[PDB]
Design a protein around this ligand. Structure first.
Ligand SMILES: O=P(O)(O)O[C@H]1[C@H](O)[C@@H](OP(=O)(O)O)[C@H](OP(=O)(O)O)[C@@H](OP(=O)(O)O)[C@H]1O
Ligand SMILES: O=P(O)(O)O[C@H]1[C@H](O)[C@@H](OP(=O)(O)O)[C@H](OP(=O)(O)O)[C@@H](OP(=O)(O)O)[C@H]1O
Lengths: 397, 397
């Protein structure tokens, strides 16, 4: 167009050849500088070699390296003994901060053992855990970003009490680094486990219900001490996890972050009677590691309650009913399972079941129920830990 | 056995080949630098070719200001290297007095870096330090006022030997400026640290019990080479610090003047006897790596004295008493601990203890005493240096 000041060319303007040459020269100079730096480093190394360092003349590895290597192996066998060895032999200073730096570096250390050690209730270990989380720089990171760093540094212990200590230290550190984001440490803690469950949900194929961004927003309603967190904040967390699962060190495929299942379920099932083997359709609620069943969805009181403590599942083929499994106690063959139910007259009595045979409406519902029940049983101490924590999260109005 | 931290050596340097290699590397580096310079020249030529001088460009370039700024930048990263750059660029003269004036003005200089440089043991640095203190006028100022002035000029280094050199230089200067105020340099030095400790005690919220003027006065009994300083002088110093904490430049909230804590302890505990296994309530005082115990808080004469050198402490189970710990000699198992105590007849005799078992009224107090005793045993180099000066402050030679 007849105008002025308009290139109407490419996205870039015209370059001049001399300028390009100058740029190339600058690059060359930079390379030369780098080379010089490398040479200087080499010279320094040579000087160190020249210098008298105490050791013996023939040596495959050196004194410091050899001693630290054995100390790391000692740590992996028994963290308390390893730390002690390193301190005694002046390979590591005695303060919680120095020990924490050693653990954070984590060179040649088993990260499961790191987790076992940091999760101990001893006063020294508690102080190391504090310094350990202080080595994680959480300022200006969203909660997932901080979790990614933290969960690279160690492997979560199996003991519910130990998991609690470490996630409490994490949540407290996050909130101090990011003040005003969450109303309480409890909020941060519970949301953290919501993120961990979402990781399992979205990335483990054994989980069929893949929550949407909107669904995850709804699930965390009232988490902020009764209030709701910003929808944008929850979306960023959801999308980060969706895009990339938690990367776990020394991953055995058995990690909590990958196998944190929802232990709760509701729905219709048929159940076979105890002494009298009649099939009845009942509304079932799995909650608090118990299977509650009701005659009608509108009933206030359950028809019966089956504690899942000490039970396991076996699939069975039934002559009449499809998609069957049994709950049974593998330790007490032929013995009645501890449970309660209501008779026709309203009397609450003990159940007469050696086994509970259950039939699901579809193969898919069978698999869902067995997963939920197994999950509920297998991680009960941990779900209990979260439940007692969530109660203090809810506020009383 | 144990090996000494600093080792002695005989001058030997069999690394002729290595040295030669280093020299070769240096030569290569020099060549690289020359090449870089050539490249820069070429770039300049290219720039000239690019530019057409219709006139000359008016952008103020100032080589002298650039060198000044460069020198400061260098100093703040490495004080020795910044000072050498300024000298080579004719912006600073090379005498200790000239370097001292440069640091004393400290224009755009990091005050922590100034302290790092002044504290060094080098012959040149020692001379700079003396000239640096000479540029401070302490005449007609009291010790707090002189300390306010001095502590504006630099930040105290962390190392005990460096602090000592700087505070010795200060105390010497103060006493020359104000003759007759203190009977010795030692008196001035120790009182300076009493003032610093007071600043910490009054102004650091971590110190619970704030000293009164009268506590500060009595704490300093005998400091003037065996005699007391004027009551009103000590009161004036106390009142000045109480009214205004030391103002520290570039303060990070972790300055020595704010964190100079008193580790000495006192309290009632129950102790088990030696030959005769009776439990006695005794008033304990821990100071200068020794545990004293008394019948009454008002006694000057202790019931016993237990030097902590060569001892260790461990928590112990007792059949009857809770919250117990034990002093024992880790290196000589079963050996009687060197101590003295008084008998009912007034004799002083050696103790008969292989261990000193002591019961605290709470688990918390047991933990506190153990921590304090362990800290005493591990020692603190600067606490010890102050202790030494306090011992030399003496009435008669
Ligand atoms: O209703 P009828 O055909 O008489 O049979 C009943 C139902 O199957 C009960 O199920 P529900 O309680 O769900 O109604 C069952 O109790 P369980 O709940 O213990 O299975 C009874 O077991 P016994 O009481 O053990 O015979 C059985 O007698
Ligand atoms: O008071 P009685 O019951 O006679 O028993 C005394 C006290 O326990 C003493 O403690 P204290 O000195 O605090 O009064 C102790 O001295 P230690 O202070 O050395 O423990 C004596 O130890 P032996 O002297 O070793 O028996 C012990 O005989």
């Amino acid at each position: 167009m007849g105008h002025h000041h308009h290139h109407h060319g490419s996205p870039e303007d015209l370059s001049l050849e001399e300028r390009e040459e100058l740029l190339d020269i600058r690059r060359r100079k930079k390379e030369l500088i780098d080379d010089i730096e490398r040479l200087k480093y080499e010279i320094a190394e040579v000087m160190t070699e020249i210098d008298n360092l105490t050791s013996v003349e023939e040596s495959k590895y050196t004194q410091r390296n050899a001693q630290i290597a054995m100390g790391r192996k000692k740590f992996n066998m028994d963290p308390k003994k390893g730390i002690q060895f390193l301190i005694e032999n002046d390979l590591l200073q005695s303060s919680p901060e120095d020990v924490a730096q050693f653990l954070y570096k984590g060179e040649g250390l088993n990260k499961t053992v790191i987790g076992d050690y940091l999760g101990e209730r001893d006063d020294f270990n508690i102080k190391v855990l504090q310094a350990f989380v202080e080595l994680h720089e959480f300022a200006d990171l969203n909660l997932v970003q901080a979790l990614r760093q933290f969960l690279w540094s160690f492997r979560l212990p199996g003991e519910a009490q130990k998991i609690d200590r470490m996630m409490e230290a994490f949540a407290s550190r996050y909130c101090l680094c990011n003040p005003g984001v969450f109303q309480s440490t409890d909020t941060c803690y519970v949301l953290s486990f919501a993120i961990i469950m979402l990781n399992t949900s979205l990335h483990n194929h054994n989980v069929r219900d893949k929550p949407t961004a909107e669904r995850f927003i709804t699930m965390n309603r009232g988490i902020n001490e009764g209030g709701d967190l910003p929808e944008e904040l929850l979306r960023n967390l959801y999308e980060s996890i969706k895009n990339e699962p938690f990367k776990i060190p020394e991953d055995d495929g058995n990690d909590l972050t990958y196998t944190f299942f929802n232990p709760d379920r509701e729905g219709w099932l048929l159940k076979l009677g105890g002494r009298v083997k009649t099939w009845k359709r009942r509304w079932f609620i799995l909650t608090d590691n118990c299977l509650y069943y009701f005659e009608y969805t509108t009933d206030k009181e359950p028809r019966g309650i089956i504690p899942l403590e000490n039970l396991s599942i076996r699939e069975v083929e039934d002559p009449r009913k499809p998609n069957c499994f049994e709950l049974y106690n593998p330790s007490h063959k032929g013995q009645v399972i501890k449970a309660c139910k209501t008779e026709a007259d309203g009397r609450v009595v003990e159940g007469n079941h050696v086994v509970y045979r259950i039939s699901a409406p579809s193969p898919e519902e069978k698999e869902e129920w067995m997963k939920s029940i197994k999950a509920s049983i297998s991680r009960d101490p941990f779900y209990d830990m979260l439940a007692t924590r969530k109660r203090r999260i809810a506020n009383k109005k």
